[PDB]
Amino acid sequence: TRSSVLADALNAINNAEKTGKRQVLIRPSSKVIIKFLQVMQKHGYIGEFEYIDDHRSGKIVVQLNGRLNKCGVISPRFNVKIGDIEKWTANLLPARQFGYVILTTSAGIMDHEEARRKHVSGKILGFVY
Amino acid sequence: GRMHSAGKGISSSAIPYSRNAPAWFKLSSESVIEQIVKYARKGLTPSQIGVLLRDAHGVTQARVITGNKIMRILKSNGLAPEIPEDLYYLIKKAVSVRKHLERNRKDKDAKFRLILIESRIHRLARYYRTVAVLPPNWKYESATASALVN
Amino acid sequence: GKGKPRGLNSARKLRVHRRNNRWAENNYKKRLLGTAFKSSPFGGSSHAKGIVLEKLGIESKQPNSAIRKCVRVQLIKNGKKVTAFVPNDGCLNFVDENDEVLLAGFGRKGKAKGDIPGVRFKVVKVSGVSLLALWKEKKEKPRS
RNA sequence: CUCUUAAGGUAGCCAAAUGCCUCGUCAUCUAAUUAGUGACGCGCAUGAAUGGAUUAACGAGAUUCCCACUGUCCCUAUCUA
RNA sequence: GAAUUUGGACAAACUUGGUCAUUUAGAGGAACUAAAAGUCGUAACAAGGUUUCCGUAGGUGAACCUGCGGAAGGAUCAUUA
RNA sequence: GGAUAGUGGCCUACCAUGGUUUCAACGGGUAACGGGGAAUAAGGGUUCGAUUCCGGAGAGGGAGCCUGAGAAACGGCUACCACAUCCAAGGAAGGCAGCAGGCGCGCAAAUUACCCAAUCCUAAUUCAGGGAGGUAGUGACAAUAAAUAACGAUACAGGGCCCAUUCGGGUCUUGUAAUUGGAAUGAGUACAAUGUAAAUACCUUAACGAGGAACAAUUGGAGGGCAAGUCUGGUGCCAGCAGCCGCGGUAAUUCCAGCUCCAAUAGCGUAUAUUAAAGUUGUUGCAGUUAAAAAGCUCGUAGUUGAACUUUGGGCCCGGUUGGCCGGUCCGAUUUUUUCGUACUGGAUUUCCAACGGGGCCUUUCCUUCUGGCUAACCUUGAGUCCUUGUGGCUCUUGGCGAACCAGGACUUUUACUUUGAAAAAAUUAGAGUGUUCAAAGCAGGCGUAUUGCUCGAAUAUAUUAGCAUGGAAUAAUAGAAUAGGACGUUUGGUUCUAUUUUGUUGGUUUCUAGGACCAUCGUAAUGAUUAAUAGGGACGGUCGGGGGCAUCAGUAUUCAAUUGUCAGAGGUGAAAUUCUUGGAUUUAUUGAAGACUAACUACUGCGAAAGCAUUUGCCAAGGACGUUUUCAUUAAUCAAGAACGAAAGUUAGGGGAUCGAAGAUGAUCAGAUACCGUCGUAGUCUUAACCAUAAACUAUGCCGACUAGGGAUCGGGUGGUGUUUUUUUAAUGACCCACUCGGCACCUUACGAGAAAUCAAAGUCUUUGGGUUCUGGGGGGAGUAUGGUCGCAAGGCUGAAACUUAAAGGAAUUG
Ligand SMILES: [Mg+2]
Ligand SMILES: [Mg+2]
Ligand SMILES: [Mg+2]
Ligand SMILES: [Mg+2]
Ligand SMILES: [Mg+2]
Ligand SMILES: [Mg+2]
Ligand SMILES: [Mg+2]
Ligand SMILES: [Mg+2]
Ligand SMILES: [Mg+2]
Ligand SMILES: [Mg+2]
Ligand SMILES: [Mg+2]
Ligand SMILES: [Mg+2]
Ligand SMILES: [Mg+2]
Ligand SMILES: [Mg+2]
Ligand SMILES: [Mg+2]
Ligand SMILES: [Mg+2]
Ligand SMILES: [Mg+2]
Ligand SMILES: [Mg+2]
Ligand SMILES: [Mg+2]
Ligand SMILES: [Mg+2]
Ligand SMILES: [Mg+2]
Ligand SMILES: [Mg+2]
Ligand SMILES: [Mg+2]
Ligand SMILES: [Mg+2]
Ligand SMILES: [Mg+2]
Ligand SMILES: [Mg+2]
Ligand SMILES: [Mg+2]
Ligand SMILES: [Mg+2]
Ligand SMILES: [Mg+2]
Ligand SMILES: [Mg+2]
Ligand SMILES: [Mg+2]
Ligand SMILES: [Mg+2]
Ligand SMILES: [Mg+2]
Ligand SMILES: [Mg+2]
Ligand SMILES: [Mg+2]
Ligand SMILES: [Mg+2]
Ligand SMILES: [Mg+2]
Ligand SMILES: [Mg+2]
Ligand SMILES: [Mg+2]
Ligand SMILES: [Mg+2]
Ligand SMILES: [Mg+2]
Ligand SMILES: [Mg+2]
Ligand SMILES: [Mg+2]
Ligand SMILES: [Mg+2]
Ligand SMILES: [Mg+2]
Ligand SMILES: [Mg+2]
Ligand SMILES: [Mg+2]
Ligand SMILES: [Mg+2]
Ligand SMILES: [Mg+2]
Ligand SMILES: [Mg+2]
Ligand SMILES: [Mg+2]
Ligand SMILES: [Mg+2]
Ligand SMILES: [Mg+2]
Ligand SMILES: [Mg+2]
Ligand SMILES: [Mg+2]
Ligand SMILES: [Mg+2]
Ligand SMILES: [Mg+2]
Ligand SMILES: [Mg+2]
Ligand SMILES: [Mg+2]
Ligand SMILES: [Mg+2]
Ligand SMILES: [Mg+2]
Ligand SMILES: [Mg+2]
Ligand SMILES: [Mg+2]
Ligand SMILES: [Mg+2]
Ligand SMILES: [Mg+2]
Ligand SMILES: [Mg+2]
Ligand SMILES: [Mg+2]
Ligand SMILES: [Mg+2]
Ligand SMILES: [Mg+2]
Ligand SMILES: [Mg+2]
Ligand SMILES: [Mg+2]
Ligand SMILES: [Mg+2]
């Protein structure tokens, strides 16, 4: 049985990148996926992506533009206090100079750079670089 | 995959992208309803009702063309059954298997299959108890089972 | 994935499961079972002194050949009899029978050292002076 | 390996109701034990339905000890028919 | 209002036994290890000279032998021809 | 009710049968007082805390109580228990886990010193008392600072930069000294003062105090790891060394030593524990085909975990912050020229681009509760008009009743989460200031006219649970209208419950009146039910199968038998022997009995959860896959406990007992031959009714989900093909052919990828480490042993240690 859906999404993307493809299929389509995909497009690690209306839960076609190394999920969506974002970024990001750890705060879903600014926190969704 | 088999089949239906339609039907909900109840009073199950309506009466679905799924209609008309169709057929089944066990007592596979079926029945009834469609107690009893399917 | 539960509400399992598993770890179990206080010839104490019962000439293990000089000591604090190696050239002549000597571990944490079999200890003092000092003739053994 | 009359004591078991020596040796119980038990076994002369070994229950059977009990005794006295 | 004294609750403690915990002696028994040396055989490793191994069962100075079913980790990835 | 200072099963009487638990109760253990804190420095963690502060308990063991505000007090008493002192033998008396000190204990821990000067406490009290506390003694616990020598002189040697034709060589600067000379100093010993309660030491300081027999630094080590001898003498598998690998058997780089050398140094070694190293406990973060390790299989409770959707988007207002820019001068100003360029500050508002962040609104959207304000509408009393119609339309008038609206206060259906605070002891820790001469420290101090003063301080961070307060609502839970016992309200009845003020006062009653609770009635309303998962279950449809149970049918063979024909061998083997045979063996013929088995067809084929399942037919119930515009709608994934099934053997009995055949017997073989080969044969081999619960129960590879690659077969199903083949004429139909497509048993090639490799489409998507989840392993032995428990008729199964021992055991591959 499917468990994370935002897991199998990011994996397909990750998988499709590695094998040289510049487009993926993502079933099913959760809002959490899209908001993630949004965050992942705001810094152009993916290109255009288009929802497909099955009368169900959805599909998505994301366009890939190389330069993606890994888009990961973290499960379980741990509780991150504000001065612990510092710690995750330490652990699961390549360098201090880039990369992202997108979260879920009460102030919506956002990359860790952003939360750092708005001074918010919550659970962790995953990461991009 | 399968719950009790180790099977990985996908053989399903495929409902169309069409909450409205069909342009060739022309018969009005109010009419088809009075055919469902006609059949439900002639003692017929929702499953095998929409099977006749899908076949001979060219009615594709019931949630479309009437806005309501079949069983929901029967309940409104007081043609709601005692226990649900799944639970029922499961209980009927488990009954007959046991009736086979009672004479053929070395059928170890039979016994095995009963353990599967009755697992299903209880899992079901548990849920049905959870959503108020069976009384708090209920539970499937073997000794009394043959009775409940009449 | 991984074979360990990852739920946000699984701490109990992850917690007991390691507590359950610390037991295959020898050093841990020795500590928890108090082997130290029970089966060990010392209390767990780093040293023990007992009285020298007899002198022994235990022969070495293969592929060596020599007569390692030791003593059967009887530990005062718990009457246990264990034997201990007497280090350095002819120091065995510094200890006598009935002579009360300080023993120490062989620095193996309980195991036998080298080719000396059955011997897990060593003589450090004798009639309370120091074997080391005696062997170097800077101290003298007080009379018996 | 060998002598001999057919073969040459296996599984077990034991100073056992079967052991001479013997009041066997060790351990145990006691102040003290030719007694009892647990062990040992080149066992005079144990041993497999001439049944061997085990064995719960049972016994007016033989035997050891403990507790209780007590004129059995120390040590006798008194009463009734 | 002292000695003295009735009952009560509190209740140390004594006698006898039970139990749980932590320790501990013991004739004798039965193992392991040091251990690589020795005696008897040669079980395994080469098709190890009876392919090896597994479970079970019985048997034998000793390793082991034999039955039934299994595995290949075999000594065969192989006979549409 | 008693009792207590008071609550309370605290105790009692009476009454009920309740209270805790796999979210681990209860019980056991602790070499357990709890906390502040300590050791270990990537992070995460690991281990420790008797011990300076707080809390707790106890005063040899227990119990009891006197006094008092306070004690169940012990430098208080009473008794028992355990100790034990004095005695004139009658009696009497003690309680150091206070300070010293003694014994004992042990590896392990100091003076029976001085004092109230300080810190503080007590009392009737400025005074008295204080083994509180301070002082000194013993003190290499731990920590700080750092002497054991410094600069010359010269003779060779030369770093000698050269001159330069040569032992011709300038002039400082290293190094060697049984060569030289002047300076320096506190360790000490000690006048003094200082210090002190009195002493002592420290600081300060006269008189002394240096040249090698001192003012003489040690502890380890010198094969590797690992820094430093192939020098010498000694020993000869001895003595001995060696954490580990190893050194020693007459040329020992490893023993015993001399020499020299290395490392740390007022210190270094050893033992024991513990942390790091250890990604060897793995949350971060391990491993499980073959190295240790996936339960034989399926079900299943607890646990963990669980598809997608419900305000999305648009447009405004508002003041915020890092860079453009340039003015201005501290300051090292740089390629190195002159009027040329590398950290510091100022900056409001430009519309001059960018990013970003806080607060408000509008877009159907501040809802929900409450209160305050402003009052419409609304019936209402009373005076007035109009009507091609009593139409109550319009106005003013009396007092009720407060839609909407504005504001402000409380407001999560119920949680988790997260932000920000508050309430928070000191010390310790992090850390700002401060020149204890530095430092560990300490919390001090700093300035001046220093002849009657001035002055900054003693910060800050901390805290990772829980509670309290607060901003947030993404994520994750949860509640709610379905037989409407639905929601809202300026509709209105009700019967219940409470009564503020008004009837003088207080009290009873009752009426109107008001609010709550509730029941109806009336109105307003878009009246209320998300998808239909390449999740799951159920129905249905035609299939498919060596899936299962009972019954039934068949096949030849094997053995045996009756009868049979014929005559000397037959058996068995590498070769034999034991054996059978003129009561005719063996071979042949007819015939019958019995029990097992199910050949060939049979395959990299099918079915089942696994074990396993193969002659026929009848009955019996089951099953996947497919098909499906059918149905229910999260009902599910995995699973401690618990349960079904579970090869062969084996066990309890009955039946059966052909064959083969454990035990046994025999013939050979051998040195032996309990064997292998041959012969006879018990049990067993089959079945029924009970057991057993294990196998290399194997793919030595958990399950569900998703993803990444190429090809050809084949099984089941389905779709498409003016394809083939079949008749008496070429329709249906059957088989077959091609393409497709699900779902299978597998095979092939590949290698982006993985691995130690063998190899792997999973064993991949793993240091770019997280989809959910169950189980197991943590060097080799000891050992699947002992012990306890449990199930079993038994055999045994399940559960399952430690002492000790040991440097490898082990995998894959390579070359011999
Ligand atoms: Mg699927
Ligand atoms: Mg399942
Ligand atoms: Mg001895
Ligand atoms: Mg003879
Ligand atoms: Mg015999
Ligand atoms: Mg025998
Ligand atoms: Mg005898
Ligand atoms: Mg007997
Ligand atoms: Mg006798
Ligand atoms: Mg006696
Ligand atoms: Mg007697
Ligand atoms: Mg006896
Ligand atoms: Mg006899
Ligand atoms: Mg006989
Ligand atoms: Mg008998
Ligand atoms: Mg009798
Ligand atoms: Mg015995
Ligand atoms: Mg013996
Ligand atoms: Mg062999
Ligand atoms: Mg062999
Ligand atoms: Mg192996
Ligand atoms: Mg009270
Ligand atoms: Mg009460
Ligand atoms: Mg009760
Ligand atoms: Mg502790
Ligand atoms: Mg304690
Ligand atoms: Mg403490
Ligand atoms: Mg603790
Ligand atoms: Mg203690
Ligand atoms: Mg007290
Ligand atoms: Mg004491
Ligand atoms: Mg007082
Ligand atoms: Mg006191
Ligand atoms: Mg007391
Ligand atoms: Mg005292
Ligand atoms: Mg004392
Ligand atoms: Mg004294
Ligand atoms: Mg000592
Ligand atoms: Mg000390
Ligand atoms: Mg004072
Ligand atoms: Mg005073
Ligand atoms: Mg006075
Ligand atoms: Mg010196
Ligand atoms: Mg000198
Ligand atoms: Mg030295
Ligand atoms: Mg070196
Ligand atoms: Mg030498
Ligand atoms: Mg060395
Ligand atoms: Mg040397
Ligand atoms: Mg490992
Ligand atoms: Mg293995
Ligand atoms: Mg296994
Ligand atoms: Mg969800
Ligand atoms: Mg407070
Ligand atoms: Mg809140
Ligand atoms: Mg569906
Ligand atoms: Mg089905
Ligand atoms: Mg014949
Ligand atoms: Mg056949
Ligand atoms: Mg289980
Ligand atoms: Mg035999
Ligand atoms: Mg015979
Ligand atoms: Mg035999
Ligand atoms: Mg097993
Ligand atoms: Mg998968
Ligand atoms: Mg493929
Ligand atoms: Mg189709
Ligand atoms: Mg298949
Ligand atoms: Mg390759
Ligand atoms: Mg070795
Ligand atoms: Mg190998
Ligand atoms: Mg090779």
Instruction: For chain A, give the DSSP string.
Output: ----SHHHHHHHHHHHHHTT-SEEE--S--HHHHHHHHHHHHTTSEEEEEEE--SSS-EEEEEE-S----EEE-SS--EE-GGGHHHHHHHH-S-TTS-B--EEETTBS--HHHHHHHT--EEE-EEE-
E strand map for chain C:
47-59, 67-75, 81-85, 101-105, 121-126
- Cβ distance A29 to A57 under 8 Å? yes
Backbone angles phi, psi at C65, to 5 degrees: -155, 110
Question: Could you tell me which residues come within 8 angstroms of residue A79 by beta carbon, excluding any fewer than 6 positions away?
Answer: A122, A123, C8
73-112 in chain B: CB under 8 A from chain A: none
How many angstroms is C1' of E36 away from CA of C103? 31
d(CA A128, CA A111): 9
d(CA C144, CA C124): 18
Q: Which amino acid is at B11?
A: S
Method: X-ray
d(CA A61, CA A25): 5
Nearest nucleotide to A129 by CA–C1' distance? F768
Tokens of C82: 């264990």
Tokens of B19: 């909450």
Phi-psi region of B123 (alpha: psi -120 to 50; beta: other; left: phi over 0): alpha
Between B108-130 and B85-101, two packed helices, what is the crossing angle to 10 degrees?
Answer: 160
User: Is the link from the previous residue into B22 a cis peptide, with omega within 30 of 0?
Assistant: yes
Backbone angles phi, psi at A80, to 5 degrees: -110, 120
- Cβ distance A102 to A110 under 8 Å? yes
CA angle B42, B44, B48 (to 5 degrees): 140
Question: Could you tell me which residues come within 8 angstroms of residue A85 by beta carbon, excluding any fewer than 6 positions away?
Answer: A101, A103, A112, A115, A116, A121
Q: Could you tell me which chains touch chain A, where touching means 3 or more CB pairs under 8 A?
A: B, C
CB atoms within 10 A of CB B121: 22
Q: Which amino acid is at C129?
A: V
Phi-psi region of A5 (alpha: psi -120 to 50; beta: other; left: phi over 0): left
Q: Which amino acid is at C104?
A: A
Ligand 31 center to C79 CA (angstroms): 27
User: Could you say which DSSP state residue C103 is in?
Assistant: E
SS3 B91: helix
The stretches of C3-100 forming alpha helices (DSSP H) are 11-21, 26-33, 35-38
User: Could you say which DSSP state residue C113 is in?
Assistant: P
* Strand bridging mode C47-59 / A122-124: unpaired
Q: Do C6 and A75 touch (CB under 8 A)?
A: yes
CA dist list (Å): C52 to A24, B45, C92, C129 = 83, 98, 11, 15
d(CA C19, CA C22): 5
Interface list for chain A against chain C, based on CB atoms closer than 8 Å: 75-79
Question: How far off is chain A from B17, nearest CA to CA, in Å?
Answer: 6
